[PDB]
Design an enzyme around this catalytic site. Structure first.
Site, mmCIF file in Angstrom:
data_model
loop_
_atom_site.group_PDB
_atom_site.id
_atom_site.type_symbol
_atom_site.label_atom_id
_atom_site.label_comp_id
_atom_site.label_asym_id
_atom_site.label_seq_id
_atom_site.Cartn_x
_atom_site.Cartn_y
_atom_site.Cartn_z
ATOM 1 N N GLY A 71 25.755 76.054 50.168
ATOM 2 C CA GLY A 71 25.606 74.611 50.114
ATOM 3 C C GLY A 71 24.194 74.194 50.482
ATOM 4 C CG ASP A 87 23.308 68.497 49.224
ATOM 5 O OD1 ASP A 87 24.419 69.067 49.103
ATOM 6 O OD2 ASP A 87 23.054 67.710 50.163
ATOM 7 C CE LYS A 132 18.250 74.888 38.541
ATOM 8 N NZ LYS A 132 19.163 75.962 39.007
ATOM 9 C CD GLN A 164 27.246 76.495 42.000
ATOM 10 O OE1 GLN A 164 26.861 77.638 41.726
ATOM 11 N NE2 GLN A 164 27.186 75.481 41.128
HETATM 12 N N1 LIG Z 1 22.110 77.764 46.854
HETATM 13 C C1 LIG Z 1 21.955 77.505 45.545
HETATM 14 O O1 LIG Z 1 21.180 78.139 44.859
HETATM 15 C C2 LIG Z 1 22.804 76.442 44.930
HETATM 16 C C3 LIG Z 1 22.974 76.358 43.545
HETATM 17 C C4 LIG Z 1 23.822 75.367 43.054
HETATM 18 C C5 LIG Z 1 24.471 74.496 43.931
HETATM 19 N N2 LIG Z 1 24.265 74.599 45.256
HETATM 20 C C6 LIG Z 1 24.935 73.709 46.196
HETATM 21 O O2 LIG Z 1 26.270 74.168 46.421
HETATM 22 C C7 LIG Z 1 27.060 73.069 46.876
HETATM 23 C C8 LIG Z 1 28.356 72.990 46.070
HETATM 24 O O3 LIG Z 1 28.031 72.842 44.687
HETATM 25 P P1 LIG Z 1 29.201 72.823 43.577
HETATM 26 O O4 LIG Z 1 28.511 72.866 42.230
HETATM 27 O O5 LIG Z 1 30.263 73.841 43.921
HETATM 28 O O6 LIG Z 1 29.817 71.358 43.766
HETATM 29 P P2 LIG Z 1 31.345 70.887 43.479
HETATM 30 O O7 LIG Z 1 31.372 69.395 43.606
HETATM 31 O O8 LIG Z 1 31.839 71.546 42.206
HETATM 32 O O9 LIG Z 1 32.244 71.505 44.662
HETATM 33 C C9 LIG Z 1 31.976 71.152 46.024
HETATM 34 C C10 LIG Z 1 33.313 71.190 46.749
HETATM 35 O O10 LIG Z 1 33.094 71.019 48.151
HETATM 36 C C11 LIG Z 1 34.232 70.329 48.652
HETATM 37 N N3 LIG Z 1 33.928 69.858 50.020
HETATM 38 C C12 LIG Z 1 33.207 68.777 50.401
HETATM 39 N N4 LIG Z 1 33.142 68.709 51.769
HETATM 40 C C13 LIG Z 1 33.829 69.770 52.255
HETATM 41 C C14 LIG Z 1 34.172 70.316 53.581
HETATM 42 N N5 LIG Z 1 33.748 69.709 54.714
HETATM 43 N N6 LIG Z 1 34.898 71.456 53.622
HETATM 44 C C15 LIG Z 1 35.339 72.095 52.522
HETATM 45 N N7 LIG Z 1 35.080 71.649 51.282
HETATM 46 C C16 LIG Z 1 34.341 70.519 51.098
HETATM 47 C C17 LIG Z 1 34.467 69.263 47.605
HETATM 48 O O11 LIG Z 1 35.783 68.729 47.722
HETATM 49 C C18 LIG Z 1 34.224 70.036 46.319
HETATM 50 O O12 LIG Z 1 35.457 70.554 45.775
HETATM 51 C C19 LIG Z 1 26.197 71.832 46.689
HETATM 52 O O13 LIG Z 1 25.547 71.530 47.944
HETATM 53 C C20 LIG Z 1 25.142 72.290 45.708
HETATM 54 O O14 LIG Z 1 23.954 71.488 45.742
HETATM 55 C C21 LIG Z 1 23.479 75.559 45.761
HETATM 56 O O1 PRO Z 2 18.850 75.704 43.130
HETATM 57 C C1 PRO Z 2 19.534 74.799 42.531
HETATM 58 O O2 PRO Z 2 19.580 74.717 41.290
HETATM 59 C C2 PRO Z 2 20.424 73.748 43.252
HETATM 60 C C3 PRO Z 2 20.281 72.560 42.800
HETATM 61 C C4 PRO Z 2 20.735 71.633 44.043
HETATM 62 C C5 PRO Z 2 20.760 72.395 45.090
HETATM 63 N N1 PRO Z 2 20.002 73.613 44.745
HETATM 64 NA NA NA Z 3 22.071 77.048 52.463
#
Ligand SMILES: NC(=O)c1ccc[n+]([C@@H]2O[C@H](COP(=O)([O-])OP(=O)(O)OC[C@H]3O[C@@H](n4cnc5c(N)ncnc54)[C@H](O)[C@@H]3O)[C@@H](O)[C@H]2O)c1
Ligand code: PRO
Ligand code: NA
Ligand SMILES: NC(=O)c1ccc[n+]([C@@H]2O[C@H](COP(=O)([O-])OP(=O)(O)OC[C@H]3O[C@@H](n4cnc5c(N)ncnc54)[C@H](O)[C@@H]3O)[C@@H](O)[C@H]2O)c1
Ligand code: PRO
Ligand code: NA
Lengths: 344, 344
Positions: free
Chosen positions: B234, B236, B77, B149
């Site tokens: 969250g 990154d 990926k 997410q």
């Molecule tokens: N754990 C995993 O497997 C996995 C998979 C995908 C994404 N992620 C991570 O999840 C996180 C969110 O991803 P997403 O796709 O939802 O992004 P997104 O941009 O769609 O949504 C993130 C939201 O967080 C909000 N935000 C920012 N700072 C904040 C705070 N202090 N308090 C509350 N809200 C806040 C933003 O306004 C935004 O609406 C990212 O760090 C991403 O890398 C993790």
């Molecule tokens: O596991 C994943 O795909 C996401 C990508 C950024 C943060 N972790």
């Molecule tokens: Na985490």
């Protein structure tokens, strides 16, 4: 937004339309300039590639090779080394693809074959190094290993040196017998010759073999010409080498990517202390290379992602001018960016 | 041989035909079985991912995530985290693609969108962890961050817990106010609530924010329910965390991938000898989770490539059943495997 995909047919069309010599020259020119930019601190070496070793049907490796042009795009080549592919499946040993991603957004913007591109930029890199480190009147090229890479080694080197003769060897009789036909377009007379004869007679040598781990050297440590330059091109598994240690310790050695060469190149056999400037620094100031033309020199080639990015740009420029390729919507861009289920 | 490409249209048709609930349940079930296989030593955690940091227009990262099934295939990926994408370009913050390569030959065999798949398996992983560690009668979900997410966090958790309401917060008022419409299909009523209220009232919480490095916690260190389970999603950049240290130190903490979590998860804040057993071990042997529903627990989620390979398998099974997708000859397979120019 859709991904621009070059089919195998489109890559074939670029070659037929541009011409083999012209295409290789474009990549040599782009590589020489890009390496000089690294040597001047205007660009940076790609990060270490990563890879996964595979043991069946024979030991091989599959690797990912990223390179970032900040604010522009990210290049990623995914490439396998599977040396049983020719005999068992009629596929090339080196099989890969190159993807381009927009650096600002992450979007996948282009995707193309990596097989031909890899062979082209690998020959080009040897031509860049050999122009710097081989005698300009080099007449005889030696090739150890006459598979896929040997074809573009001879082609690229024939464009930057006055080659009249190529002395070639392969452990597979069918592969050395067929090389002259695959090389006919270069015009350079090919002769089959055993490794000791290649070592004794060649002005420049490229080694590009699928030799197994621990089964080197593929070139004997015997009488070599004082000015010999070797492009050590074979590279795959940790512990695979092609040159004799005594020759390497005698030589001026330059790596394309020093940390990669220490792990996967001939520099596996040396200490990190022992190496000279890298190829990028020689492109930036060839004064450091001129005085090594008449002594024994080794270019330790491993391949790095910057070379693939530069070669891809040459192909994309030529394909755009000829309206080649297809557009495929691969990534899901939801109508609402915050709703993964908003399939547009 | 040609690459099987699933266009965005094909992925949309898979989820449309199968339905969101059933497709999410399939991925939950497959992830549960696959994690137990890792816990039993029949399969292995993916290697650490790698990535390139990008500072403009805001700090983000672009990563590569390989997973190998020896003798079968390799999944890769490629995925960007670009948190200005929604506001600036109307694109999702998480933008990626998933490829499959034959392990024997190296050939690219399949390629598909990673946006929907990532959201699905990330919700699914939280559902697997929350089934083990949240109270089975959990009624109130808290969400901090209501972006992409958060949609699949709410959806997946609503399939495994009897959720009646979601208390939600985002620092962007537009994003928290739009969440109820994106969530409506789940039937879970949505109420905007400040983080301190979410901490006090929720039975299970998912944090999934684009908070910048060093600007945590997104949930305050205050009173929480005794049985609270948090999915810390969250993840990154190194230095980005979401939870308060004091809460983490009182919690039972299970990571999806211990080494990755110590580098990029909430476990960045923790001494490595304080980790609970990883999620795979909980799946194979529930003794480690016995009784932990009734105390504070944290699932430190970072995502790893095995999850993407498993979700891709679910998509490819459905696509193969329905003969969806296209075949594109991308790799150049010369008729002569030893001749890169045989554009055959
Ligand atoms: N754990 C995993 O497997 C996995 C998979 C995908 C994404 N992620 C991570 O999840 C996180 C969110 O991803 P997403 O796709 O939802 O992004 P997104 O941009 O769609 O949504 C993130 C939201 O967080 C909000 N935000 C920012 N700072 C904040 C705070 N202090 N308090 C509350 N809200 C806040 C933003 O306004 C935004 O609406 C990212 O760090 C991403 O890398 C993790
Ligand atoms: O596991 C994943 O795909 C996401 C990508 C950024 C943060 N972790
Ligand atoms: Na985490
Ligand atoms: N440095 C780079 O940038 C770069 C790029 C591509 C490939 N490579 C490497 O170059 C090597 C060759 O790749 P290829 O595409 O030409 O493979 P190939 O399978 O097409 O050709 C390799 C040839 O080596 C021959 N050979 C094996 N052992 C030998 C020996 N002891 N002496 C002489 N010949 C021998 C084989 O018979 C075969 O003909 C591989 O290690 C590959 O990973 C390096
Ligand atoms: O740089 C490359 O593409 C090849 C792959 C194997 C060895 N080096
Ligand atoms: Na080498």
């Amino acid at each position: 937004m859709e991904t621009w995909v070059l089919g195998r047919r489109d890559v074939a069309e670029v070659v037929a339309a541009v011409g083999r010599d012209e295409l290789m020259r474009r990549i040599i020119d782009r590589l020489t300039g890009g390496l000089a930019e690294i040597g001047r601190g205007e660009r940076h070496l790609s990060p270490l590639r990563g890879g996964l070793e595979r043991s069946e049907p024979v030991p091989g490796i599959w690797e990912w090779m990223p390179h970032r042009e900040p604010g522009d795009h990210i290049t990623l080549k995914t490439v396998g080394y599977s040396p049983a592919n020719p005999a068992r499946f009629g596929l090339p040993t080196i099989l890969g693809t190159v993807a381009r991603y927009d650096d600002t957004t992450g979007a996948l913007t282009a995707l193309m074959d990596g097989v031909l591109l890899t062979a082209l930029r690998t020959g080009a890199a040897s031509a860049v190094a050999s122009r710097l480190l081989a005698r300009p009147d080099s007449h005889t090229l030696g090739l150890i290993g006459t598979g896929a890479q040997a074809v573009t080694q001879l082609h690229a080197l024939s464009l930057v040196l006055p080659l009249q003769r190529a002395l070639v060897w392969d452990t597979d009789p069918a592969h050395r017998e067929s090389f002259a036909r695959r090389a006919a377009f270069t015009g350079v007379s090919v002769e089959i010759a055993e490794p000791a004869r290649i070592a004794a007679e060649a002005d420049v040598i490229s080694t590009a073999t699928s030799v197994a781990v621990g089964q080197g050297p593929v070139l004997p440590d015997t009488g070599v010409r004082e000015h010999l330059h070797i492009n050590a091109v074979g590279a795959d598994l940790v512990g695979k080498t092609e040159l004799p240690l005594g020759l390497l310790e005698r030589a001026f050695v330059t790596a394309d990517h020093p940390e990669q060469a220490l792990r996967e190149g001939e520099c596996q056999q040396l200490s990190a202390d022992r190496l000279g400037p890298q190829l990028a620094h020689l492109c930036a100031d060839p004064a450091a290379a001129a005085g090594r033309q008449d002594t024994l020199s080794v270019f330790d080639s491993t391949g790095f992602a910057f070379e693939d990015a530069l070669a891809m740009e040459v192909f994309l420029e030529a394909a755009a001018e000829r309206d080649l390729g297809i557009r495929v919507g691969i990534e899901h861009h939801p109508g609402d960016a915050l709703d993964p289920y908003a399939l547009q």
